[PDB]
Design a protein around this ligand. Structure first.
Ligand SMILES: Nc1nc2c(ncn2[C@@H]2O[C@H](COP(=O)(O)OP(=O)(O)OP(=O)(O)O)[C@@H](O)[C@H]2O)c(=O)[nH]1
Ligand SMILES: Nc1nc2c(ncn2[C@@H]2O[C@H](COP(=O)(O)OP(=O)(O)O)[C@@H](O)[C@H]2O)c(=O)[nH]1
Ligand SMILES: [Mg+2]
Ligand SMILES: [Zn+2]
Ligand SMILES: [Zn+2]
Lengths: 430, 55, 53, 49, 43, 51, 55, 442, 91
């Protein structure tokens, strides 16, 4: 059961470098690539993320794509950068210009065949292939355009596998890019047709986690990318270690998605707490559940109290009793019953895995399907309509060649997604 | 009389790849409800093949 | 626990004592009150001990 | 590249690394990404050298 | 609960992983391989 | 105590881990958690690592 | 009072012990269903909720 | 004189580990499959034969298959302590799970694996001379357990015909729950279990958690405790085949005495001296006290209350120090009680069994050691109440077709939901009708 | 929530006090925004008050997410089906 990773654009390549550091640490792989681990449990599932080189060494199954090699050059110079296969780095000779239309239509079609060739070479080598995993930002240029292009091509070529994306989305308070509404709207239009499941993270939520919860004096992008790599590596933990109640990406999708358009999820990770306050409270399943539902530990700016949970999933790592898990999930569902959709008799799936991350006794990652995501799409659609009515920056996209009808189609599809979420929020049995 | 698996062991394009640069045109954009038909979206893909399901 | 049965006050969710239930919707059992009271796990912790029912 | 052929990929330090100091990779402890822990900030085209 | 009636713990009691009550401590059963591949390949 | 950017802050001379609990033994980071690499069916009970 | 409250917990009364009462004037008989409803299957022309977009 | 065990999916394999641990320790087979015997021909026993066969090298091997679609649990069995006990062909594992879809297991994926399982079962049945049934362990809440268990029971029922199939089934608990789609899989499962099983024993984890909290003194129970209790029950029922006794009971006697009509085959199970070591100091354990214990609803391993129904038949298995006269006095006292009720068409309500071998003690276990025990399996109309809670959850989800697109995409007609829901309604009405007192001329 | 008289009185007092506090806070905010107290700023203040959002509530009786099934059965008249049915045994 093998995963193929794709890293696209600056954000994707930077998060990927930290992810592969975390994964190499968890499996005891030296930065030279030699296995140096200390239990057979580490070795017996190494195939899931690593390919095997001949003597000691293991090589990681990842494709790196960008239009200018600067980010790749930064990751290759990093402490673990050498592990990556040289042939897996694909780059052009001129930048995306932070423009979606360039990234999708002009430099996209120039590079895409070499990326598809590398992805096919990696996919056809597996004895049984599990889903693809893609990291990119939606506000950027090459990330949005080529990520969604590649996703569409892989969905044509591999329609029976799983398609998973991790995606960075614009903060509600401060923009990092002026043309964010166009790139976001077009990317969400592509994703809602093509994708099976998409996770969304706000950089503002990571800043608030670091400053308020962890009380870090001088946080850096390494910390935000470590938080993301921690949750990403947690979702896959049941694929690659033993446990009392195994789980799988397809099983998560089957329990989380009621209808095929409603596949956008919120993420959180629970045992966040500052080193000074750790002495006051010990680790236990009630404590993890309390942190798990605390909005302080959720990676988006929208708050659950303005919506309702359709479904949720919790993956627990560590040696613990099933009784405490079951009774905690029952007590939380009964005590907060107005925030859970009533025509589903039980909204939470649990899973339990024996092996925690090093130096923590227990951890849980939380995935939530909540209607408050509609507020984000509504905000993006508002900002899009403000820009489009006035043709605010439209000549760049039209000069590349896009029909305005593309913009009206993407707006209509997102507006229907918002309406569908709002209707299911307020539905009733009658 | 059946194929070995529900997953296709027969496929036209594998590791050889296909010409994807010639398929992208700005005047042939994607429309609503025009995505790839997939078993997760509720379409019975297995009925197109010759795989014999359990009666 | 808030909503415990050992108080005169009713801190349970709205219409909890007459909620939609397998003894009421699409069925009609004479023992609806007993099963409604039994399946209230975090609220009968003194009556049942630390038991589910 | 079209520069002198004697150039080679430079050497970087990246001090204060938890994995090299017998410590777990804890949350909020990625000191090796702090710019004060590097010895230079000059970007070098390592993918060609 | 209350621990004021609990018996004391002696200094020679093994409370580590070796003192676990399991199939190892039951000396009636023999865990050394006698017949099979592992016993064949044993030094 | 001070308020910065809408959040509370404490000076680290009154917010720090404890300096006691020095057991005088050497351990790798994989030996911090007892039973780090054993499953429930292999060993369903919890105990300190063997010396 | 030979059978008892059948495991039910009744509110105490200053006099005697209360006993459960059936629907209308019928005798108490737990475990027997008075009115069972099986909903009809959906009509063939009904719109499938996963077929398309919009509300 | 033998029985073959079929273990399906995660719950069934994990319960199998506890069962085979117990049967090994009770007979005395070492973990590598060896057992010393007598050197003179004719002075030897046979009790192992019900569960083990010996190889020409003297290794013992058990009459079981382990079936799973995911590798992890079977690889855990392969790498554990009992590695050398099982034959490697018996441990069968696929590539990928049925993803909580009954439809995926039944149509798409179990269809690939089912013929290997049937070939292994055939190879077992050829190495027998008095096979008298199949024991099946599965959960109906998950995808592969429901779908492949149903498909395999259908195929077994065609190939073997009259041979009996007795199921131990973990049904979805009435308010503890683990997955969202449990009602659909359990509803679709119950139709196959209805057609293709001779007696079905129902279990709920919530009841065994309550039992381990109330009777045992365990603050944090886990699945190994529940699986050890299930193993003890199975050992009690099969002890009648394996050891000397006053009143033996062959597996056909269970079906003859317990099943009044061919559809009315779902039974409740309970076990008496579940007690902690501290309690053993202060409790006498006479025949009549444990017989009184087996009738308390706090003793049951399924979350149903039998006071809301009527008993049709009870089968009481006593093992240990019991005298038939004490069993008779106990049963007559139970018969005297007015809180215990039998349908008026079943006057002689009881079957008894008496075996001399007391229950075995497992090194890590939580039960006390006791000189005698009694185990009961009983048929009662109260079980109709258990199905109604699953059907209500099905109606709640199905009113909006909440997840149906997965099932329809993976190969199933929408019609199958309505058929199964109507079949469970008819089964509920059958249990209502069979339990109605007397009749009238008009 | 609870149906005692004390709880009802507390809820009514809370409603009145919350309304008054919201009104006075909005007027203070508008006065701070404009730095004037003339009559010409009342229309824009009313428009801003109308534009102000409020937190949602899911315990309302308009979508009615928490039905009282026993009261509904008593009102409709589901007292039991005499003479049996196609799915119910006659008593
Ligand atoms: N008593 C008991 N219940 C278990 C055990 N393992 C799982 N269950 C329960 O059975 C249900 C889950 O069924 P699974 O066995 O995991 O399903 P599956 O056979 O693996 O099917 P797939 O997920 O498609 O592979 C849940 O209700 C669990 O609580 C166990 O070891 N003992
Ligand atoms: N969390 C995180 N966000 C990033 C990182 N790099 C860029 N971003 C964000 O992603 C957006 C910019 O997209 P970008 O990656 O530059 O698009 P590109 O030019 O196509 O590669 C902005 O919102 C940035 O704040 C990173 O390393 N971590
Ligand atoms: Mg499974
Ligand atoms: Zn009150
Ligand atoms: Zn003014």
């Amino acid at each position: 059961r093998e995963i193929v990773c794709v890293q696209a654009g600056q954000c994707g390549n930077q998060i990927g470098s930290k992810f592969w550091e975390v994964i190499s640490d968890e499996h005891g792989v030296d930065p030279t690539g030699t296995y140096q681990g200390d239990s057979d449990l580490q070795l017996e599932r190494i195939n899931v993320y690593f390919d095997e080189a001949t003597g000691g060494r293991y090589v990681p199954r990842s494709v790196l794509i960008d239009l200018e090699p600067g980010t790749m050059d930064s990751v290759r110079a990093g402490p673990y950068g050498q592990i990556f296969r040289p042939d897996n780095f694909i780059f052009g000779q001129s930048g995306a210009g932070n423009n979606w239309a360039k990234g999708h239509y002009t430099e996209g079609a120039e590079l895409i065949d070499s990326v598809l060739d590398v992805c096919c070479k990696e996919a056809e080598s597996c004895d049984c292939l599990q889903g693809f995993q893609i990291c990119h930002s939606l506000g950027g240029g090459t990330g949005s355009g080529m990520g969604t292009l590649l996703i569409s091509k892989l969905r044509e070529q591999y329609p029976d596998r799983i398609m998973m994306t991790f995606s960075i989305i614009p903060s509600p308070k401060v923009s990092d890019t002026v043309v964010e509404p166009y790139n976001t709207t077009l990317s969400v239009h592509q994703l809602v047709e093509n994708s099976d499941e998409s996770m969304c993270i706000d950089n503002e939520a990571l800043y608030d986690i670091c400053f308020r919860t962890l009380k870090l004096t001088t946080p850096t992008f390494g910390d935000l990318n470590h938080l993301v790599s921690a949750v990403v590596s947690g979702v896959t933990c049941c694929l690659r270690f033993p446990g009392q109640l195994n789980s799988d990406l397809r099983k998560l999708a089957v329990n989380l998605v009621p209808f095929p358009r409603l596949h956008f999820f919120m993420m959180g990770f629970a045992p966040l707490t500052s080193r000074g306050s750790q002495q006051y409270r010990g680790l236990s399943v009630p404590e993890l559940t309390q942190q798990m539902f605390d909005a302080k530990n959720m990676m988006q700016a929208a708050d659950p109290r303005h919506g309702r949970y359709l479904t949720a999933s919790a993956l627990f790592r560590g040696r613990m009793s099933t009784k405490e898990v079951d009774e905690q999930m029952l007590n939380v569902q009964n005590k907060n019953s107005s925030y859970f959709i009533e025509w589903i008799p039980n909204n939470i799936k649990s899973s339990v895995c024996d092996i925690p991350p090093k130096g923590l006794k227990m951890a849980v990652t939380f995935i939530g399907n909540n209607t408050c995501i509609q507020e984000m799409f509504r905000r993006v659609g508002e900002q899009f309509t403000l820009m489009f009515r006035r043709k605010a920056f439209l000549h760049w996209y039209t000069g590349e060649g896009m029909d305005e009808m593309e913009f009206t189609e993407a707006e209509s599809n997102m507006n229907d997604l918002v309406s569908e979420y709002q209707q299911y929020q307020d539905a009733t049995i009658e | 009389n059946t194929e070995p698996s529900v997953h296709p062991a027969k496929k036209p394009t594998g590791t050889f790849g296909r010409e994807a640069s010639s398929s992208v045109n700005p005047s042939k954009f994607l429309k609503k409800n025009e995505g790839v038909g997939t078993a997760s979206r509720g379409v019975p893909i297995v009925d197109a093949t010759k795989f014999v399901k359990a009666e | 626990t808030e909503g415990r049965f050992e108080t005169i006050h009713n801190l349970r969710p709205k219409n909890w004592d007459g909620r939609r239930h397998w003894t009421n919707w699409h069925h009609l059992y004479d023992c609806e009150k007993d099963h409604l009271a039994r399946e209230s796990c975090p609220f009968h912790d003194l009556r049942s001990g630390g038991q589910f029912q | 590249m079209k520069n002198s052929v004697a150039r080679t990929q430079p050497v970087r330090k990246y001090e204060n690394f938890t994995l090299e100091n017998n410590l777990p990779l804890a949350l909020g402890a990625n000191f090796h990404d702090d710019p004060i822990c590097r010895d230079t900030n000059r970007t070098s085209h390592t993918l060609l050298l | 609960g209350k621990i004021t009636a609990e018996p004391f713990r002696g200094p020679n009691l093994n409370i580590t992983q070796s003192g676990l009550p399991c199939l190892d401590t039951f000396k009636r059963v023999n865990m050394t391989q006698t017949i099979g591949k592992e016993a064949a390949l044993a030094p | 105590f001070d308020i910065r950017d809408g959040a509370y802050t404490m000076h680290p001379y009154a917010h720090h881990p404890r300096d006691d609990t020095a057991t005088g033994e050497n351990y790798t980071p994989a030996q911090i958690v007892p039973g780090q690499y054993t499953s429930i069916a292999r060993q369903p009970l919890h105990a300190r690592n063997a010396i | 009072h030979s059978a008892g409250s059948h495991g039910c917990v009744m509110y105490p009364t200053p006099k005697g012990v209360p006993l459960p009462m059936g629907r209308d004037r019928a005798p108490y008989t737990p475990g027997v269903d008075r009115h069972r409803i099986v909903p009809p299957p959906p009509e063939p022309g009904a719109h499938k909720p996963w077929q398309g977009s919009g509300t | 004189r033998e029985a073959i065990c079929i273990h399906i999916g995660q719950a069934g394999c994990q319960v199998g580990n506890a069962c085979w641990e117990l049967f090994c320790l009770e007979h005395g087979i070492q973990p590598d499959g060896a057992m010393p015997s007598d050197k003179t021909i004719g002075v030897e026993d046979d009790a192992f034969n019900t569960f083990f066969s010996e190889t020409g090298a003297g290794k013992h091997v058990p009459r079981a298959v382990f079936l799973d679609l995911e590798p992890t649990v079977v690889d855990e069995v392969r790498t554990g302590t009992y590695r050398q006990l099982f034959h490697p062909e018996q441990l069968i594992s696929g590539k990928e799970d049925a993803a909580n879809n009954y439809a995926r297991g039944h149509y798409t994926i179990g269809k690939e694996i089912v013929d290997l399982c049937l070939d292994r079962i055939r190879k077992l049945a050829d190495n027998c001379t008095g096979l008298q049934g199949f024991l099946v362990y599965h959960a109906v809440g998950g995808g592969t357990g429901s779908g492949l268990g149903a498909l395999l029971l259908e195929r077994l029922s065609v190939d073997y015909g009259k041979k009996s199939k007795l199921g131990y089934t973990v049904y979805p608990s009435p308010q503890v729950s683990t997955a969202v789609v449990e009602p659909y899989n359990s509803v679709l499962s119950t139709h196959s279990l209805l057609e293709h099983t001779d007696v079905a024993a129902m279990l709920d984890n919530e009841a065994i958690y309550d039992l381990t909290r109330r009777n045992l003194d365990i603050e944090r129970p886990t699945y190994t405790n529940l699986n050890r209790l299930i193993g003890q029950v199975v050992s009690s029922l099969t002890a009648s085949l394996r050891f000397d006794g006053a009143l033996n009971v062959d597996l056909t006697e269970f079906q003859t005495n317990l099943v009044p009509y061919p559809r009315i085959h779902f039974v409740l199970t309970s076990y008496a001296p579940v007690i902690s070591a501290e309690k053993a100091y202060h409790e006498q354990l006479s025949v009549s006290e444990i017989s009184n214990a087996v009738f308390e609803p706090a003793s049951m391993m399924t979350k149903c209350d039998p006071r809301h129904g009527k008993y049709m038949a009870c089968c009481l298995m006593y093992r240990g120090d019991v005298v038939p006269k004490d069993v008779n006095a106990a049963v007559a006292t139970i018969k005297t009680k007015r809180t215990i009720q039998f349908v008026d068409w079943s006057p002689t309500g009881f079957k008894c069994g008496i075996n001399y071998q007391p229950p075995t003690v497992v090194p890590g276990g939580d039960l006390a050691k006791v000189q005698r025990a009694v185990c009961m399996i009983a048929n009662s109309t109260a079980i109709a109440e258990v199905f109604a809670r699953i059907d209500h959850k099905f109606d709640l989800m199905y009113s909006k077709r909440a997840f149906v697109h997965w099932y329809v995409g993976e190969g199933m007609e929408e019609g199958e939901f309505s058929e199964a829901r109507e079949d469970l309604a008819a089964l509920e009405k059958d249990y209502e009708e069979v339990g109605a007192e007397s009749a009238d001329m008009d | 929530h609870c149906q005692c008289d004390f709880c009802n009185s507390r809820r009514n007092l809370n409603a009145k006090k919350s309304a008054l506090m919201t009104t006075v806070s909005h007027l203070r905010e508008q006065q701070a925004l404009h730095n004037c107290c003339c009559q010409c700023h009342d229309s824009l203040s009313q428009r801003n008050y109308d534009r102000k959002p409020q937190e949602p509530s899911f315990e309302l009786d308009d979508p009615e997410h928490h039905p009282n099934q026993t009261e509904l059965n008593a009102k409709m008249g589901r007292n039991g089906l005499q003479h049996g049915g196609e799915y119910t045994i006659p008593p």
